[PDB]
Symmetry: C2
Subunit: 128 residues, 2 copies
């Protein structure tokens, strides 16, 4: 089964920088990232989350996000894709980085989930 | 006693983007952010972290960081300033954002700590690069 990592942020700079941070230890994984709105402003959109999902070469996507206000769009995309999304309610940086490094190292999905379970947090924050 | 927020990342783009994200909810707080080495590499350095600390108008700094490999530098900088750093073992984005919004609203220091208590996490990742 193929796995990939998707990062969604309210900020294009967060997404960009996190992707680079991850790539320094995970050059081989299937990784996509998106942040902000089409005009570079802070936010998320259905279309841009959808594109990050569809852009990823893998069909089983471990998906990470920053603020609680992003969860809606991920859930909307989840309803409409043939990909299998696993959305994790974990910190964006620490969770995506940990998952990415494990995936790169060859960890199984169950092993990755076990580690991410330890990081579940309440994702209550919202952007206005 | 005034308080400010400091963001430290291995990435200059994460630091800048998080600052910008926070400024949408917290326009008035004393907030500084830095990431990367002087030479542009991903990482953290003593001097750049020190600059973010010294540039912050506040003397009591609630300090947030991304990966465990940043913690040593923060501890070293803490030794080398008269400012009082409170370093949180919490997620960088969600921690700094939550604390910044509370600070902006006029929450007390104890009230900020109260809300960050549920965010306490082990910060065990250590960055590498070749």
């Amino acid at each position: 089964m193929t796995y990939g990592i998707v990062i969604v942020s309210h900020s294009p700079e967060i997404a960009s920088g996190l992707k680079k941070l991850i790539r320094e230890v995970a050059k081989n994984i299937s990784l996509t990232a998106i942040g902000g709105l089409e005009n570079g402003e802070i936010g998320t959109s259905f279309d841009r989350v959808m594109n990050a999902i569809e852009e990823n070469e893998a069909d089983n996507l471990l998906t990470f996000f920053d603020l609680g206000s992003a969860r809606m769009n991920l859930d909307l995309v989840s309803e409409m894709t043939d990909k299998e999304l696993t959305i994790f309610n974990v910190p964006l940086i620490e969770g995506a980085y940990t998952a990415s490094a494990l995936l790169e190292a060859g960890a199984t999905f169950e092993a990755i989930k076990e580690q991410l379970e330890k990081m579940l947090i309440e994702k209550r924050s919202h952007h206005h």
